[PDB]
Amino acid sequence: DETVNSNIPTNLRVLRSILENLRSKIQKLESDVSAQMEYCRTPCTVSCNIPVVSGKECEEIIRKGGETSEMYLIQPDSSVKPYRVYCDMNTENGGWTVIQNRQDGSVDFGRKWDPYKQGFGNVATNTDGKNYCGLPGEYWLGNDKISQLTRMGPTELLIEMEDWKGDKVKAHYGGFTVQNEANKYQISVNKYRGTAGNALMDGASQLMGENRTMTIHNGMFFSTYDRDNDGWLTSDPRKQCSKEDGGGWWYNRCHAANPNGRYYWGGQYTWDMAKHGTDDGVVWMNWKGSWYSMRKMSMKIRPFFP
Amino acid sequence: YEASILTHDSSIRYLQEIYNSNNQKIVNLKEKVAQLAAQCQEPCKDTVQIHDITGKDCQDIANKGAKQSGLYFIKPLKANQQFLVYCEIDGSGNGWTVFQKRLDGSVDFKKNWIQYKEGFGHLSPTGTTEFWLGNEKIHLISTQSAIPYALRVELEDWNGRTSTADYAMFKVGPEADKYRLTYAYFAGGDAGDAFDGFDFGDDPSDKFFTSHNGMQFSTWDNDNDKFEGNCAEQDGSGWWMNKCHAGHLNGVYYQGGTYSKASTPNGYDNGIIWATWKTRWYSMKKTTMKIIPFNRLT
Amino acid sequence: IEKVQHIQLLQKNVRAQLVDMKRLEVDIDIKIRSCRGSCSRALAREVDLKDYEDQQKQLEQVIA
Ligand SMILES: *[C@@H]1O[C@H](CO)[C@@H](O)[C@H](O)[C@H]1NC(C)=O
Ligand SMILES: [Ca+2]
Ligand SMILES: [Ca+2]
Ligand SMILES: [Ca+2]
């Protein structure tokens, strides 16, 4: 009771400072959310005049003269109406249709099954005072559309990423396909080459035996936080790979990479930052390892001409 | 400096207050954060859109209701797939389907065969962008079963003066015949019948060297003119060249209007010229070529 | 004694509320930034995890 009754007074002032510190932070935040709510009383807007040249997909478009990377209109098949897409016409000979793109966290990626089915986000934006949209936005083309494209014929997949120090690596896949909804958009890939680490087919580098194998994405089904189709078998509604606000991906048990994860600014992040203390976030372990969100990440496809 | 140890019990409960109070404010905040997130799911609104109304051409569409200009999807009878076009509807129910446009030189018209076939440029609701629909598409629209068409060449100089030149039975052929332009007759217009030829005084055959009716399309990588050389490669464009022209709306867009032989290492008259309305050294400020069923042109 | 048990609970509690607040901080940051693609504009801001990180280390240097 000598100094003990001194340790107590120390906590009654320490705890007191924190609790009153936090209560004020709560106030600052409540304020920030109200301003943003006011900014949402109106939307952002784009003026994307549509290019004339068009076709089944970006490869055909570039073969018709479309040589500038921007938003184009494409009709992969005469059944469904034509849709907007972003064409990368410079990266490795061009002709790439962008199916996924992350670059600034302007778009929520933690969505339910239906939005991942139809697609969401912004395809393109207006560039330095111009009538056309030459810069891509953040978007996920949509499972249905991606499946239809990869099945039209041999499709190759190019995955690009950048960290917060400007470093860039890439993952190539000469063969890539995605079945339809009835088959849970099951994914299959092959013929790897790159500098990012074949995380899709071999699972995370820093893992051994079954611990690594369970991080293989190839052959996995697609799951959203409201639709479990992962490699985790159990009745434990807690062990699932995709929790709320988590992205939709070809999760297994659980991942080596997740291009559709939350966009953490700065890169590194801790367990006491993650809503569920799980490794959600633009991850690609085989390069930057676990708990590190990329600054830029994209997925592009192109017909594969042997 | 440490107060009475009887204060503890009180102070212990007071911290418990600002702790539970905080946790509550945190629950209320997390609900507000949910609402905010639900207001940030939509994408940016695009000012440009494409009407759901469709048809064989812009006229077929208007005869269906289309009341305002803007991008539409048409699919001529013998066409494989549908494609986007810029329909022009006026206060009379006329649906002009436009295939060429100039208004600021924001589009380089020096393109090849493929490009001139598939089309280049941009379409827009406000009809404020330059483009070239594409020979193949222009061909499908003007050769639909038994439907005679009419072309109207609307011009404008740098002063708000605007003339026009209408040609009846306008028609463009298939690649097999090099997208050949043909028409039955000049149907009027203060712009003048440039397609018929023009006598510049440079040669006794000028007229013969500058008529466009029956001329095949030509681009630099596909010389189909009536000259020893390459008209298209000289003027740097794609057009129904002869030897070479009297009306060239796909020319180099010279800013201001006036230019001369001091404009090129060979002093070519490669501007948007229409000889019967202005001198071959005066590139227009605007240009627009649109077609519509002939049996509609009053 | 027993009044001491009250403090050993408020220690774990204010640590839980510290982690909970830290997460809410990051959460709000990601959501606010994600409106940039939907709303007229997004509140330009920057998180100060540091202050959060100190109060955590500072609590442990009192929890013992
Ligand atoms: C697999 O993970 C567990 C922890 O989840 C770890 O204890 C074990 O050593 C790992 N297996 C390997 C590859 O050693
Ligand atoms: Ca969400
Ligand atoms: Ca599961
Ligand atoms: Ca020749």
PDB file of C-alpha atoms in Angstrom, chain B residues 196-292:
ATOM      1  CA  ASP B 196     -18.554  17.351-110.884  1.00  0.00           C
ATOM      2  CA  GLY B 197     -15.107  18.883-111.376  1.00  0.00           C
ATOM      3  CA  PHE B 198     -13.629  22.382-111.558  1.00  0.00           C
ATOM      4  CA  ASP B 199     -11.597  24.334-114.116  1.00  0.00           C
ATOM      5  CA  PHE B 200      -8.619  25.869-112.333  1.00  0.00           C
ATOM      6  CA  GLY B 201      -6.906  27.053-115.506  1.00  0.00           C
ATOM      7  CA  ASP B 202      -3.853  24.959-114.615  1.00  0.00           C
ATOM      8  CA  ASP B 203      -4.600  22.513-117.423  1.00  0.00           C
ATOM      9  CA  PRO B 204      -7.178  22.129-120.238  1.00  0.00           C
ATOM     10  CA  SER B 205      -8.242  18.860-118.583  1.00  0.00           C
ATOM     11  CA  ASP B 206      -8.640  20.159-114.994  1.00  0.00           C
ATOM     12  CA  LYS B 207     -12.349  19.316-114.936  1.00  0.00           C
ATOM     13  CA  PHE B 208     -11.498  15.786-116.125  1.00  0.00           C
ATOM     14  CA  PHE B 209      -8.789  15.496-113.460  1.00  0.00           C
ATOM     15  CA  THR B 210     -11.005  16.808-110.660  1.00  0.00           C
ATOM     16  CA  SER B 211     -14.384  15.053-110.948  1.00  0.00           C
ATOM     17  CA  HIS B 212     -15.362  12.659-108.138  1.00  0.00           C
ATOM     18  CA  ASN B 213     -18.386  10.729-109.375  1.00  0.00           C
ATOM     19  CA  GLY B 214     -17.348   7.115-109.889  1.00  0.00           C
ATOM     20  CA  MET B 215     -14.028   7.598-108.103  1.00  0.00           C
ATOM     21  CA  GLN B 216     -12.724   4.831-105.844  1.00  0.00           C
ATOM     22  CA  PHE B 217     -11.533   5.552-102.324  1.00  0.00           C
ATOM     23  CA  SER B 218      -7.814   6.064-101.857  1.00  0.00           C
ATOM     24  CA  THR B 219      -5.435   6.264 -98.906  1.00  0.00           C
ATOM     25  CA  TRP B 220      -1.638   6.425 -98.993  1.00  0.00           C
ATOM     26  CA  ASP B 221      -1.187   2.664 -98.496  1.00  0.00           C
ATOM     27  CA  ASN B 222      -3.854   1.982-101.136  1.00  0.00           C
ATOM     28  CA  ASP B 223      -3.470   4.114-104.289  1.00  0.00           C
ATOM     29  CA  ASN B 224      -6.694   3.857-106.285  1.00  0.00           C
ATOM     30  CA  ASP B 225      -6.732   7.303-107.941  1.00  0.00           C
ATOM     31  CA  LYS B 226      -6.507   8.337-111.628  1.00  0.00           C
ATOM     32  CA  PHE B 227      -3.023   9.871-111.328  1.00  0.00           C
ATOM     33  CA  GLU B 228       0.491   8.674-112.142  1.00  0.00           C
ATOM     34  CA  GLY B 229       1.393   9.373-108.542  1.00  0.00           C
ATOM     35  CA  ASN B 230      -0.320   9.074-105.178  1.00  0.00           C
ATOM     36  CA  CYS B 231      -2.901  11.779-104.463  1.00  0.00           C
ATOM     37  CA  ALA B 232      -3.698  10.435-101.017  1.00  0.00           C
ATOM     38  CA  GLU B 233      -0.033  10.295 -99.972  1.00  0.00           C
ATOM     39  CA  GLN B 234       0.410  13.871-101.200  1.00  0.00           C
ATOM     40  CA  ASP B 235      -2.548  15.409 -99.398  1.00  0.00           C
ATOM     41  CA  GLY B 236      -1.998  13.055 -96.449  1.00  0.00           C
ATOM     42  CA  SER B 237      -5.525  11.652 -96.148  1.00  0.00           C
ATOM     43  CA  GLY B 238      -8.174   9.252 -97.407  1.00  0.00           C
ATOM     44  CA  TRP B 239     -10.617  10.223-100.127  1.00  0.00           C
ATOM     45  CA  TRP B 240     -12.263   9.569-103.473  1.00  0.00           C
ATOM     46  CA  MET B 241      -9.267  10.949-105.385  1.00  0.00           C
ATOM     47  CA  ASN B 242      -9.020  11.471-109.124  1.00  0.00           C
ATOM     48  CA  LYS B 243      -6.060  13.673-110.106  1.00  0.00           C
ATOM     49  CA  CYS B 244      -6.664  14.938-107.637  1.00  0.00           C
ATOM     50  CA  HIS B 245      -9.709  16.806-106.367  1.00  0.00           C
ATOM     51  CA  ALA B 246     -12.141  19.708-106.549  1.00  0.00           C
ATOM     52  CA  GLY B 247     -13.823  18.988-103.234  1.00  0.00           C
ATOM     53  CA  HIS B 248     -11.823  17.480-100.352  1.00  0.00           C
ATOM     54  CA  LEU B 249     -13.435  17.440 -96.903  1.00  0.00           C
ATOM     55  CA  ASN B 250     -10.859  15.045 -95.389  1.00  0.00           C
ATOM     56  CA  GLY B 251      -7.996  17.458 -95.938  1.00  0.00           C
ATOM     57  CA  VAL B 252      -5.462  18.936 -93.540  1.00  0.00           C
ATOM     58  CA  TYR B 253      -7.264  21.240 -91.131  1.00  0.00           C
ATOM     59  CA  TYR B 254      -5.548  24.635 -91.526  1.00  0.00           C
ATOM     60  CA  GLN B 255      -6.340  26.961 -88.631  1.00  0.00           C
ATOM     61  CA  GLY B 256      -7.739  30.375 -89.522  1.00  0.00           C
ATOM     62  CA  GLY B 257      -8.800  29.422 -93.016  1.00  0.00           C
ATOM     63  CA  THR B 258      -6.253  31.072 -95.286  1.00  0.00           C
ATOM     64  CA  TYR B 259      -3.109  29.232 -96.391  1.00  0.00           C
ATOM     65  CA  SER B 260      -0.843  28.871 -99.434  1.00  0.00           C
ATOM     66  CA  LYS B 261       2.038  27.080-101.136  1.00  0.00           C
ATOM     67  CA  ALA B 262       4.131  28.448 -98.285  1.00  0.00           C
ATOM     68  CA  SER B 263       2.424  25.771 -96.192  1.00  0.00           C
ATOM     69  CA  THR B 264       4.259  22.715 -97.542  1.00  0.00           C
ATOM     70  CA  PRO B 265       7.627  21.562 -99.027  1.00  0.00           C
ATOM     71  CA  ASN B 266       5.693  21.054-102.271  1.00  0.00           C
ATOM     72  CA  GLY B 267       3.035  23.743-102.010  1.00  0.00           C
ATOM     73  CA  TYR B 268       0.108  21.325-102.228  1.00  0.00           C
ATOM     74  CA  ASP B 269      -3.467  22.509-101.799  1.00  0.00           C
ATOM     75  CA  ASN B 270      -4.233  19.854 -99.208  1.00  0.00           C
ATOM     76  CA  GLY B 271      -6.823  21.578 -97.049  1.00  0.00           C
ATOM     77  CA  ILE B 272     -10.553  21.163 -96.560  1.00  0.00           C
ATOM     78  CA  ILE B 273     -11.371  22.735 -99.916  1.00  0.00           C
ATOM     79  CA  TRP B 274     -14.593  22.765-101.925  1.00  0.00           C
ATOM     80  CA  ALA B 275     -13.606  24.612-105.136  1.00  0.00           C
ATOM     81  CA  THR B 276     -17.092  25.792-106.085  1.00  0.00           C
ATOM     82  CA  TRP B 277     -17.554  27.808-102.876  1.00  0.00           C
ATOM     83  CA  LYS B 278     -14.057  28.981-101.911  1.00  0.00           C
ATOM     84  CA  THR B 279     -10.555  28.993-103.417  1.00  0.00           C
ATOM     85  CA  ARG B 280      -8.374  25.897-103.143  1.00  0.00           C
ATOM     86  CA  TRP B 281      -6.284  27.905-100.668  1.00  0.00           C
ATOM     87  CA  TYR B 282      -9.075  28.290 -98.119  1.00  0.00           C
ATOM     88  CA  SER B 283      -9.583  25.310 -95.782  1.00  0.00           C
ATOM     89  CA  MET B 284     -13.077  25.277 -94.251  1.00  0.00           C
ATOM     90  CA  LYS B 285     -13.760  25.819 -90.527  1.00  0.00           C
ATOM     91  CA  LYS B 286     -16.383  23.074 -90.410  1.00  0.00           C
ATOM     92  CA  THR B 287     -17.451  20.103 -92.499  1.00  0.00           C
ATOM     93  CA  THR B 288     -20.215  17.569 -92.219  1.00  0.00           C
ATOM     94  CA  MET B 289     -21.361  14.819 -94.563  1.00  0.00           C
ATOM     95  CA  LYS B 290     -24.676  13.182 -93.710  1.00  0.00           C
ATOM     96  CA  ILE B 291     -26.987  10.792 -95.517  1.00  0.00           C
ATOM     97  CA  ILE B 292     -30.720  10.103 -95.366  1.00  0.00           C
TER      98      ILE B 292
END
